[PDB]
Specification:
It is classed as splicing. The entry lists the keywords S. cerevisiae, pre-A complex, Prp5, U1 snRNP, U2 snRNP, prespliceosome, splicing. Saccharomyces cerevisiae spliceosomal pre-A complex (delta BS-A ACT1). Chain A is Pre-mRNA-splicing factor RSE1. This is part of a larger assembly, with chains A and B. Chain A is mainly β. Chain A has strands spanning 2-3, 6-7, 18-23, 29-33, 37-43, 47-52. A four-stranded antiparallel β-sheet of chain A has the order 3-4-5-6, with no helix packed on it. Chain B has seven helices and no strands. Chain B is rod-shaped. The chains are: A mainly beta, B mainly alpha.
Chain lengths: 71, 146
């Protein structure tokens, strides 16, 4: 976590490498990892909640991920 | 789906010179057209049966690999698969895994055989670590006296 002069450390997925991550629209995040995705939204202050999670085809290793603002 | 009259009608209609050539060359017979067509269908069918099941070429897509992906998939679904876990309890865990659907949908027995072979290799490695541990314990020079 980043703030002015305040740099601190903190859910999500810490057990797998992250191919990609990006912000979607307003106040939403998605984290794409090799095995599965995560759709994360902010809740409160230090909390976040995944509204949905994806597999790849049905259970493979995702090669790559890219994104746009809403896409 | 192909009778000789239908195969002929396709080539009778277009008036195809390669078909007609059998009637025009003196070393071929006009009824040899049917013999060639039967032999070409029989060779194609024989080669489709061999190709879709057992390829006689190289660098394609046969079986084999499905075992390597399945043996890997069993390490992926449970890390360090227990030597007392059975083939019928590992199957509902991996029924989510599509990799298994590729192996099971070819042969139900080969899945059980690969479950036995993978678990048996782990059980041998589990014995070797235990026997090496017992050997290191006995090698300790507690030469008791008095």
């Amino acid at each position: 976590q980043i703030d002015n002069e305040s740099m601190e450390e903190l859910f999500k997925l810490s057990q797998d490498t992250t191919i990609h991550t990006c912000l979607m629209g307003s106040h939403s995040i998605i984290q794409v990892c090799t095995a599965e995705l995560r759709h994360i939204v902010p809740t409160g202050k230090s909390r976040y909640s995944n509204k949905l999670t994806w597999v790849p085809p049905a259970g493979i290793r995702i090669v790559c991920a890219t994104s746009s603002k809403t896409q | 789906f192909i009778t000789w009259q239908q195969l002929l009608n396709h080539y009778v209609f277009d008036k195809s010179k390669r078909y007609m050539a059998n009637r025009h060359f003196k070393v071929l017979t006009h009824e040899d057209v049917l013999n060639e067509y039967l032999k070409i269908v029989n060779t194609i069918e024989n080669d489709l049966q061999n190709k879709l099941n057992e390829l006689r070429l190289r660098n394609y897509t046969r079986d084999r690999i499905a075992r390597d992906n399945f043996k890997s998939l069993l390490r992926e679904v449970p890390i360090k698969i227990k030597a007392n876990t059975r083939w019928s309890d590992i199957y509902p865990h991996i029924k989510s895994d599509p990799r298994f659907l590729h192996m099971l949908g070819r042969n139900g027995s080969s899945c059980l055989d690969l479950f036995l072979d993978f678990v048996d290799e782990q059980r041998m490695y589990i014995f070797a670590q235990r026997s090496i541990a017992q050997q290191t314990l006995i090698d300790q020079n507690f030469e008791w006296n008095d």
